[PDB]
Amino acid sequence: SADRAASDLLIGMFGSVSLVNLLTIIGCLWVLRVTRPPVSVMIFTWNLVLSQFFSILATMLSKGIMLRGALNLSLCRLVLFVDDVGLYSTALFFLFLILDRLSAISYGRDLWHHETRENAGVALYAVAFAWVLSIVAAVPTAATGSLDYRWLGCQIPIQYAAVDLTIKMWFLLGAPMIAVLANVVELAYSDRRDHVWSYVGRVCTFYVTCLMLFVPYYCFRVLRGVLQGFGIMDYVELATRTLLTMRLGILPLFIIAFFSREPTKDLDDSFDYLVERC
Amino acid sequence: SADRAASDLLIGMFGSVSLVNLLTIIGCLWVLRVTRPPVSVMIFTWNLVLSQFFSILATMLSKGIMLRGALNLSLCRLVLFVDDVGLYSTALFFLFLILDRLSAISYGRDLWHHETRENAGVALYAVAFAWVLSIVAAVPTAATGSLDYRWLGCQIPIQYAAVDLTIKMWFLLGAPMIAVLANVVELAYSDRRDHVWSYVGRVCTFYVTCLMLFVPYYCFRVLRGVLQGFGIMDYVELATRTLLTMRLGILPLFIIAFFSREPTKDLDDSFDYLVERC
Amino acid sequence: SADRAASDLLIGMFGSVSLVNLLTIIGCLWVLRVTRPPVSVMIFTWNLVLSQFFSILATMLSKGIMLRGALNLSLCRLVLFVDDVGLYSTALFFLFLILDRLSAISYGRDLWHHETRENAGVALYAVAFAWVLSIVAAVPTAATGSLDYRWLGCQIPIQYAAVDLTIKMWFLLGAPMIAVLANVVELAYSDRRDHVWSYVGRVCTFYVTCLMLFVPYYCFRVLRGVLQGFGIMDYVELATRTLLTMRLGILPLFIIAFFSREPTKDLDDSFDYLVERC
């Protein structure tokens, strides 16, 4: 049982680091308001922060950091539901933020004085849809969650792993990145192309990061149904599970990366003026 | 069994009301031909009318309004197949009609004399695929239908509720609502933006209406697998199922809402001219 | 067992014919390099050729042309995994090739001297994702493959037919053609429309061919779960399977069809110049 305590400490350390990172993003977003951002960006970025907080909070309860002993089936289903709600919302919020910025930057209207009320209305309507769709997509998982017996956490049973991977694959990489690739391909041959490749390079490394964090875990879960103390098959499950947990500290860093055309330059101006007078 | 008889009356009244509404749309579409619309609109709208008629006809048989006693497994599977064919076709026809009109209105070419043969050819091929995909997508639900024993209808069992919701979610609001949002987001920053917000307001309330009608019934069916005369869990199933039945009287009203840029103004000219001389 | 041997000969003959066709496509692509194509086309077409080779090789092992007797569960799962990897990659590669060429031809920049380094970078990054997604999407198949008993080949059990059709429907005609139809619908109403209808007429017949080759086999497999020596239900399964195997000789013919705007004219110039001097 010594390995279980070590795994509990490692997950808790990652989450505490991730929680500090999220608070830094919240503070960074707060000081970025001086460089007037469009309401569309503000709606998407703030909803991303809320979704990340839900995923971080539910992940620790899923790993049983402090709820060991009281983790029944009712709590296991509720925790797994909240985790996927943040998991699904982040994919949709990032997809809409990328699409909003790709269209805005390409047409040359990405500043505060370049957006209308209708632009803000679409962002609010898109955010409301993404929240509701995430709840609906996470309903099947709330009716199939079960306790973990190798470890002391919460995880969907292996018999539903194939269905779980299919929903996750479409929601995280199937739909969001086919739509992004279709838009980029059309954007690559258009006249509104010169000032979009800096942003396109950011969305390429973002989906690669998402690809290398989500694929190893769910693919292994499906494969464990035929591959059959702890053994080698149990430590690799933990090894591929922490990679999923590291998304709580890497994804929040991409909120600023998609904030504007050159966030690293606007942030310096905002911070320099913040420390000078206000 | 008194409540069951009242259930048939409520569904039967809704179907008769919906049938009257559909006939009004058929008549309204007929009198709208004087304001000669593009062939692309005519192909989509008339195929929608055929799709709605299939859904209305199959829903009455699904509830067992007149087929009680003879509702075996073979008929229940066949009826559930036809009902989902109309359910899937309507989502695809509405998605293609919205996309066709959004592009046509934005570019300023939405009248009869602004379309070519190739525009009509795309609409014909898009309709042909949407009919075939609906048949294919409704094949799995034609091999898993079963008799309902709480009520005297015909519904998919609860063990396939998770799979049923996943297919329905993608078809009704998964693919069509992402594709529409992706186009609208691009349209919000383009020069072809001034005369598209009247139509965008119509597609926003349409998908909200679809969200309010479809989500509660299928989400409850999945949740009923874990929540476990009639009881409270049986009346809420009927309450959340009638909302699905009201789609037969609400969706046909959106056929004219997407007919053109300002259907409420073109309809008045068509009706006023028709009653005068022809 | 006489009919079983005949089926082995028919499938083997189709593969040998398909193998010759693929080698002709490889040779045809090699002689098409004189008419300098963009690197984006070269990346997509060559990756398509590799995917067809995987599908051709795995299909023959799946049918047990020469591996009868040693076809265990481990070999059956591996072969079925490879076949879907080629099957899924072809759908994604064809979708990206169509989208790349539709955008390039519409904007008037489809020649070698009209593409930039960023154009080739997107094609390389899109190909890398399509390979990874195909591997991930084929992972569930490797966990559910089983040995065939009515015949001596490899095929998914009928209990997973519903899940198999859902994944295949989305990958082959669900996502790729919704995105294609959405782009074409917008293209039909734009100014960049005059010189795209020759290509659009080519993607309409291609997807119809995919519709009539993939649908019958998977739709029948789901229906066989309720419809219940060899009988009529076993010969139709063979008849509906050779249509799937026939895709190995039809799909490679579409690699050159999507090569450029008018491949039948560029090929003649390339072949005539090759036989003259070099």
Side-chain angles (χ1 to χ4, degrees), chain C residues 235-260:
Chain C
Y235 281 107
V236 58
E237 183 182 2
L238 173 68
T240 203
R241 138 85 52 179
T242 70
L243 257 69
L244 204 75
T245 315
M246 262 167 78
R247 95 203 181 266
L248 310 172
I250 298 184
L251 293 194
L253 255 63
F254 276 101
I255 300 182
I256 292 128
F258 297 143
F259 190 77
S260 60

Side-chain angles (χ1 to χ4, degrees), chain B residues 1-62 64-147 149-264 267 270-271 273 275 278:
Chain B
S1 180
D3 294 67
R4 274 189 218 161
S7 163
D8 264 43
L9 245 199
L10 185 41
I11 296 300
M13 163 248 281
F14 270 178
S16 187
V17 152
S18 280
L19 186 60
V20 154
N21 286 14
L22 188 66
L23 292 189
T24 305
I25 305 309
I26 290 177
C28 200
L29 284 185
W30 177 249
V31 311
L32 274 179
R33 91 204 181 287
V34 288
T35 89
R36 324 171 41 210
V39 176
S40 157
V41 158
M42 277 177 22
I43 290 180
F44 283 131
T45 46
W46 281 121
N47 282 285
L48 264 166
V49 153
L50 195 43
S51 149
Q52 301 293 339
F53 180 67
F54 276 169
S55 190
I56 287 176
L57 178 134
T59 286
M60 280 326 110
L61 305 189
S62 179
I65 309 294
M66 24 179 187
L67 295 196
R68 276 201 306 175
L71 261 204
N72 282 274
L73 270 183
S74 303
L75 298 194
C76 180
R77 290 195 224 256
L78 177 65
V79 163
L80 278 172
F81 168 77
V82 173
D83 161 279
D84 295 7
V85 159
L87 192 140
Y88 296 144
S89 306
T90 285
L92 286 185
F93 292 150
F94 263 127
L95 160 67
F96 293 145
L97 175 58
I98 286 172
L99 287 182
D100 178 277
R101 285 295 96 190
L102 271 184
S103 304
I105 295 179
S106 59
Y107 279 109
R109 34 178 60 90
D110 53 344
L111 306 175
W112 61 299
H113 61 267
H114 275 156
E115 77 156 359
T116 51
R117 184 271 161 181
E118 302 104 22
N119 307 99
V122 168
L124 195 34
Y125 157 88
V127 161
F129 153 63
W131 271 118
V132 175
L133 187 67
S134 311
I135 301 282
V136 169
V139 153
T141 181
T144 180
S146 177
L147 279 181
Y149 288 110
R150 306 295 310 139
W151 310 94
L152 293 191
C154 155
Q155 100 186 315
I156 173 174
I158 202 161
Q159 35 176 340
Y160 306 88
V163 185
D164 197 29
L165 176 132
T166 291
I167 303 179
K168 256 80 169 188
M169 158 210 101
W170 184 89
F171 251 91
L172 301 168
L173 319 96
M177 205 182 171
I178 277 175
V180 159
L181 261 182
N183 196 275
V184 164
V185 160
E186 176 175 353
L187 201 61
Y189 297 94
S190 41
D191 326 297
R192 51 204 166 90
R193 160 190 45 187
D194 325 312
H195 330 98
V196 310
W197 291 124
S198 59
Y199 204 92
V200 160
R202 302 216 277 275
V203 305
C204 282
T205 169
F206 162 65
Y207 283 113
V208 159
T209 304
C210 283
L211 184 87
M212 291 176 11
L213 293 181
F214 299 145
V215 158
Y217 171 67
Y218 296 111
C219 268
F220 172 80
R221 276 306 271 172
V222 166
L223 280 172
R224 203 174 185 271
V226 280
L227 300 183
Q228 300 284 343
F230 298 113
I232 186 58
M233 271 285 118
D234 262 297
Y235 281 97
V236 61
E237 182 180 1
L238 178 128
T240 203
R241 141 84 66 176
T242 59
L243 256 71
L244 205 75
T245 314
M246 317 201 329
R247 98 200 184 263
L248 313 170
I250 294 184
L251 293 196
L253 255 63
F254 275 103
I255 299 179
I256 314 178
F258 295 144
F259 192 73
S260 58
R261 188 179 301 177
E262 211 56 20
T264 197
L267 181 51
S270 62
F271 225 91
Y273 147 83
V275 298
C278 309

Side-chain angles (χ1 to χ4, degrees), chain A residues 49-62 64-264 267 270-271 273-275:
Chain A
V49 155
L50 190 44
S51 62
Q52 301 293 339
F53 180 67
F54 275 169
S55 188
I56 287 175
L57 172 140
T59 285
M60 313 287 136
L61 308 192
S62 179
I65 306 291
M66 25 190 192
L67 312 186
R68 279 201 306 175
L71 231 49
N72 283 275
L73 270 185
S74 304
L75 254 297
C76 205
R77 295 176 206 270
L78 180 65
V79 164
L80 282 175
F81 170 76
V82 173
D83 157 20
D84 290 348
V85 162
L87 200 152
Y88 293 144
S89 307
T90 285
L92 284 185
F93 292 149
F94 262 128
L95 158 68
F96 292 144
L97 175 58
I98 286 171
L99 288 183
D100 179 277
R101 286 296 96 192
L102 270 182
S103 301
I105 295 179
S106 59
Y107 277 112
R109 36 180 62 89
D110 53 347
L111 306 178
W112 67 281
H113 63 267
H114 270 150
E115 74 157 358
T116 84
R117 181 267 150 172
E118 302 105 21
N119 304 101
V122 170
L124 211 156
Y125 162 63
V127 153
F129 146 68
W131 271 119
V132 178
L133 185 65
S134 310
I135 300 280
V136 171
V139 157
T141 290
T144 180
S146 177
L147 275 180
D148 213 358
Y149 286 111
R150 295 310 300 172
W151 309 92
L152 294 192
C154 264
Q155 86 181 0
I156 169 174
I158 185 151
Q159 38 176 340
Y160 304 90
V163 185
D164 197 29
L165 176 131
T166 293
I167 304 179
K168 257 81 170 187
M169 163 214 91
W170 180 98
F171 223 98
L172 300 170
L173 304 131
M177 106 171 291
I178 275 176
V180 157
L181 261 177
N183 194 277
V184 164
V185 155
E186 177 197 5
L187 199 60
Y189 293 98
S190 51
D191 325 297
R192 36 167 189 127
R193 155 191 44 183
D194 326 303
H195 328 97
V196 313
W197 291 118
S198 59
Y199 203 93
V200 162
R202 301 216 278 276
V203 306
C204 281
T205 170
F206 164 65
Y207 282 106
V208 161
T209 301
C210 284
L211 182 77
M212 87 194 177
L213 286 183
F214 303 142
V215 158
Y217 179 72
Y218 297 105
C219 269
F220 172 81
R221 208 69 178 91
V222 173
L223 281 170
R224 202 176 185 271
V226 296
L227 297 181
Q228 301 284 343
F230 297 114
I232 185 57
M233 209 68 79
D234 281 39
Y235 281 110
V236 59
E237 182 181 2
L238 170 68
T240 199
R241 172 65 168 98
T242 69
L243 253 73
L244 204 68
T245 315
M246 308 175 29
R247 100 210 188 255
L248 310 168
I250 297 184
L251 294 197
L253 256 63
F254 273 102
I255 298 182
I256 287 132
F258 294 147
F259 192 74
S260 58
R261 187 180 303 176
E262 221 45 34
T264 192
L267 185 51
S270 61
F271 253 113
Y273 146 90
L274 181 270
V275 299

Side-chain angles (χ1 to χ4, degrees), chain C residues 41-53:
Chain C
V41 158
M42 272 176 54
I43 289 179
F44 285 130
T45 46
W46 281 120
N47 284 283
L48 263 163
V49 152
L50 183 54
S51 63
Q52 313 294 140
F53 181 57

